[PDB]
Enzyme design. Sequence first.
Site, PDB file in Angstrom:
ATOM      1  N   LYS A  97       0.821  -1.182   0.000  1.00 43.48           N
ATOM      2  CA  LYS A  97       0.000   0.000   0.000  1.00 43.48           C
ATOM      3  C   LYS A  97       0.871   1.253   0.000  1.00 43.48           C
ATOM      4  O   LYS A  97       0.571   2.233  -0.693  1.00 43.48           O
ATOM      5  CB  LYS A  97      -0.857   0.001   1.225  1.00 43.48           C
ATOM      6  CG  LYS A  97      -1.762   1.170   1.287  1.00 43.48           C
ATOM      7  CD  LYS A  97      -2.526   1.074   2.562  1.00 43.48           C
ATOM      8  CE  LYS A  97      -3.899   1.648   2.419  1.00 43.48           C
ATOM      9  NZ  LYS A  97      -4.758   1.088   3.513  1.00 43.48           N
ATOM     10  N   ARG A 123       2.277   1.819  -3.390  1.00 46.58           N
ATOM     11  CA  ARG A 123       1.211   2.255  -4.279  1.00 46.58           C
ATOM     12  C   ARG A 123       0.907   3.729  -4.102  1.00 46.58           C
ATOM     13  O   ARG A 123       0.750   4.464  -5.076  1.00 46.58           O
ATOM     14  CB  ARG A 123      -0.091   1.443  -4.061  1.00 46.58           C
ATOM     15  CG  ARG A 123      -1.236   2.024  -4.921  1.00 46.58           C
ATOM     16  CD  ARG A 123      -2.468   1.159  -4.984  1.00 46.58           C
ATOM     17  NE  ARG A 123      -3.054   0.935  -3.674  1.00 46.58           N
ATOM     18  CZ  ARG A 123      -3.766   1.831  -3.025  1.00 46.58           C
ATOM     19  NH1 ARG A 123      -3.960   3.026  -3.565  1.00 46.58           N
ATOM     20  NH2 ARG A 123      -4.344   1.496  -1.884  1.00 46.58           N
ATOM     21  N   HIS A 142       2.810   6.091  -2.344  1.00 47.89           N
ATOM     22  CA  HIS A 142       3.930   7.021  -2.223  1.00 47.89           C
ATOM     23  C   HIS A 142       5.153   6.875  -3.090  1.00 47.89           C
ATOM     24  O   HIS A 142       5.957   7.775  -3.088  1.00 47.89           O
ATOM     25  CB  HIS A 142       4.366   7.135  -0.743  1.00 47.89           C
ATOM     26  CG  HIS A 142       3.239   7.439   0.206  1.00 47.89           C
ATOM     27  ND1 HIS A 142       2.584   8.654   0.232  1.00 47.89           N
ATOM     28  CD2 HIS A 142       2.646   6.681   1.155  1.00 47.89           C
ATOM     29  CE1 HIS A 142       1.641   8.636   1.155  1.00 47.89           C
ATOM     30  NE2 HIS A 142       1.659   7.443   1.728  1.00 47.89           N
ATOM     31  N   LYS A 174      -8.438  12.105  -1.607  1.00 55.80           N
ATOM     32  CA  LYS A 174      -7.478  12.108  -0.518  1.00 55.80           C
ATOM     33  C   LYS A 174      -6.976  13.543  -0.516  1.00 55.80           C
ATOM     34  O   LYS A 174      -6.515  14.048  -1.535  1.00 55.80           O
ATOM     35  CB  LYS A 174      -6.344  11.129  -0.778  1.00 55.80           C
ATOM     36  CG  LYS A 174      -5.471  10.996   0.426  1.00 55.80           C
ATOM     37  CD  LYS A 174      -4.376   9.985   0.268  1.00 55.80           C
ATOM     38  CE  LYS A 174      -3.673   9.812   1.633  1.00 55.80           C
ATOM     39  NZ  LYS A 174      -2.402   9.049   1.590  1.00 55.80           N
ATOM     40  N   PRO A 175      -7.144  14.240   0.614  1.00 60.49           N
ATOM     41  CA  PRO A 175      -6.759  15.634   0.869  1.00 60.49           C
ATOM     42  C   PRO A 175      -5.291  15.993   0.509  1.00 60.49           C
ATOM     43  O   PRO A 175      -5.041  16.993  -0.182  1.00 60.49           O
ATOM     44  CB  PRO A 175      -7.019  15.790   2.369  1.00 60.49           C
ATOM     45  CG  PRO A 175      -7.979  14.745   2.686  1.00 60.49           C
ATOM     46  CD  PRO A 175      -7.624  13.594   1.849  1.00 60.49           C
ATOM     47  N   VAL A 176      -4.334  15.209   1.017  1.00 60.08           N
ATOM     48  CA  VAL A 176      -2.906  15.428   0.745  1.00 60.08           C
ATOM     49  C   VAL A 176      -2.227  14.093   0.557  1.00 60.08           C
ATOM     50  O   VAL A 176      -2.564  13.115   1.240  1.00 60.08           O
ATOM     51  CB  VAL A 176      -2.143  16.198   1.908  1.00 60.08           C
ATOM     52  CG1 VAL A 176      -1.914  15.336   3.087  1.00 60.08           C
ATOM     53  CG2 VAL A 176      -0.756  16.648   1.423  1.00 60.08           C
ATOM     54  N   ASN A 177      -1.267  14.066  -0.357  1.00 59.92           N
ATOM     55  CA  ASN A 177      -0.495  12.870  -0.628  1.00 59.92           C
ATOM     56  C   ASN A 177       0.849  13.231  -1.218  1.00 59.92           C
ATOM     57  O   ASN A 177       0.937  14.060  -2.097  1.00 59.92           O
ATOM     58  CB  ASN A 177      -1.235  11.926  -1.576  1.00 59.92           C
ATOM     59  CG  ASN A 177      -0.616  10.555  -1.589  1.00 59.92           C
ATOM     60  OD1 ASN A 177      -0.642   9.862  -0.579  1.00 59.92           O
ATOM     61  ND2 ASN A 177       0.017  10.189  -2.690  1.00 59.92           N
ATOM     62  N   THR A 178       1.900  12.592  -0.742  1.00 57.93           N
ATOM     63  CA  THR A 178       3.224  12.881  -1.236  1.00 57.93           C
ATOM     64  C   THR A 178       3.800  11.700  -2.044  1.00 57.93           C
ATOM     65  O   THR A 178       3.674  10.562  -1.618  1.00 57.93           O
ATOM     66  CB  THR A 178       4.128  13.132  -0.014  1.00 57.93           C
ATOM     67  OG1 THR A 178       3.546  14.151   0.794  1.00 57.93           O
ATOM     68  CG2 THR A 178       5.560  13.511  -0.439  1.00 57.93           C
ATOM     69  N   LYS A 233       3.868  11.741  14.467  1.00 61.71           N
ATOM     70  CA  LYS A 233       2.869  12.729  14.805  1.00 61.71           C
ATOM     71  C   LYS A 233       1.836  12.155  15.753  1.00 61.71           C
ATOM     72  O   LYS A 233       1.313  12.846  16.609  1.00 61.71           O
ATOM     73  CB  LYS A 233       2.170  13.254  13.556  1.00 61.71           C
ATOM     74  CG  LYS A 233       2.988  14.191  12.753  1.00 61.71           C
ATOM     75  CD  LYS A 233       2.225  14.628  11.518  1.00 61.71           C
ATOM     76  CE  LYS A 233       2.882  15.847  10.876  1.00 61.71           C
ATOM     77  NZ  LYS A 233       2.448  16.038   9.454  1.00 61.71           N
ATOM     78  N   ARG A 291      -1.885  18.456  -3.155  1.00 60.72           N
ATOM     79  CA  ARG A 291      -2.789  19.094  -2.210  1.00 60.72           C
ATOM     80  C   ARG A 291      -4.097  19.407  -2.918  1.00 60.72           C
ATOM     81  O   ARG A 291      -4.103  20.032  -3.992  1.00 60.72           O
ATOM     82  CB  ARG A 291      -2.152  20.393  -1.735  1.00 60.72           C
ATOM     83  CG  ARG A 291      -2.541  20.800  -0.355  1.00 60.72           C
ATOM     84  CD  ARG A 291      -1.577  20.223   0.650  1.00 60.72           C
ATOM     85  NE  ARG A 291      -0.500  21.150   1.017  1.00 60.72           N
ATOM     86  CZ  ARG A 291       0.720  20.779   1.424  1.00 60.72           C
ATOM     87  NH1 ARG A 291       1.045  19.492   1.518  1.00 60.72           N
ATOM     88  NH2 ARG A 291       1.611  21.704   1.777  1.00 60.72           N
ATOM     89  N   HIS A 326       3.832   3.899   6.193  1.00 62.36           N
ATOM     90  CA  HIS A 326       3.095   5.166   6.300  1.00 62.36           C
ATOM     91  C   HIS A 326       4.013   6.363   6.128  1.00 62.36           C
ATOM     92  O   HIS A 326       5.153   6.344   6.584  1.00 62.36           O
ATOM     93  CB  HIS A 326       2.344   5.195   7.664  1.00 62.36           C
ATOM     94  CG  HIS A 326       2.120   6.569   8.256  1.00 62.36           C
ATOM     95  ND1 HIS A 326       1.063   7.383   7.899  1.00 62.36           N
ATOM     96  CD2 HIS A 326       2.774   7.232   9.246  1.00 62.36           C
ATOM     97  CE1 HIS A 326       1.076   8.485   8.632  1.00 62.36           C
ATOM     98  NE2 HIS A 326       2.104   8.413   9.458  1.00 62.36           N
ATOM     99  N   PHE A 327       3.542   7.382   5.414  1.00 61.86           N
ATOM    100  CA  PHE A 327       4.303   8.608   5.222  1.00 61.86           C
ATOM    101  C   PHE A 327       3.791   9.599   6.281  1.00 61.86           C
ATOM    102  O   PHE A 327       2.628   9.995   6.273  1.00 61.86           O
ATOM    103  CB  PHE A 327       4.069   9.147   3.823  1.00 61.86           C
ATOM    104  CG  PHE A 327       5.052  10.205   3.416  1.00 61.86           C
ATOM    105  CD1 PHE A 327       6.201   9.870   2.702  1.00 61.86           C
ATOM    106  CD2 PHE A 327       4.829  11.546   3.725  1.00 61.86           C
ATOM    107  CE1 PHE A 327       7.098  10.868   2.307  1.00 61.86           C
ATOM    108  CE2 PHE A 327       5.741  12.553   3.323  1.00 61.86           C
ATOM    109  CZ  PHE A 327       6.850  12.215   2.629  1.00 61.86           C
ATOM    110  N   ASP A 328       4.667  10.026   7.179  1.00 61.54           N
ATOM    111  CA  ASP A 328       4.237  10.896   8.249  1.00 61.54           C
ATOM    112  C   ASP A 328       4.359  12.387   7.963  1.00 61.54           C
ATOM    113  O   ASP A 328       3.406  13.129   8.172  1.00 61.54           O
ATOM    114  CB  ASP A 328       5.019  10.522   9.510  1.00 61.54           C
ATOM    115  CG  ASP A 328       4.272  10.837  10.784  1.00 61.54           C
ATOM    116  OD1 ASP A 328       3.105  10.438  10.956  1.00 61.54           O
ATOM    117  OD2 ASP A 328       4.856  11.491  11.652  1.00 61.54           O
TER     118      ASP A 328
END
Length: 124
Positions: free
Chosen positions: A7, A10, A12, A41-45, A66, A85, A119-121
């Site tokens: 995931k 996929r 990031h 999705k609000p934000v994704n890097t 966080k 964004r 997970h991307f923090d």
Amino acid sequence: KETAAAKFERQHMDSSTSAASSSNYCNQMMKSRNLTKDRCKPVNTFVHESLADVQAVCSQKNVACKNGQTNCYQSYSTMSITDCRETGSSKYPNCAYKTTQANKHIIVACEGNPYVPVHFDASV
């Protein structure tokens, strides 16, 4: 089912490009990767480094997540990333994104055996 690690790749990973190619980039990628399926999705890097490079971050600088957990790690070097964004005109299912390229340290949460990113923090 999709493992946590799959995931992460996929959502990031994008090693095919070294930078945020166009102003179109986030609109195309967020849809391609299925990040606008249940909502926008609000934000994704996206990270434009090799997978080996991003995985190596799990052995780098341990920092607090966080959420308060302690399985987060910060890259010693900056990496090429693109932040997506959600914009104002973004109305589900017509999600709209602003594409922003940057070079920053990434912070990822890791777990499992092998210990890989799940997970991307944050980026700093």
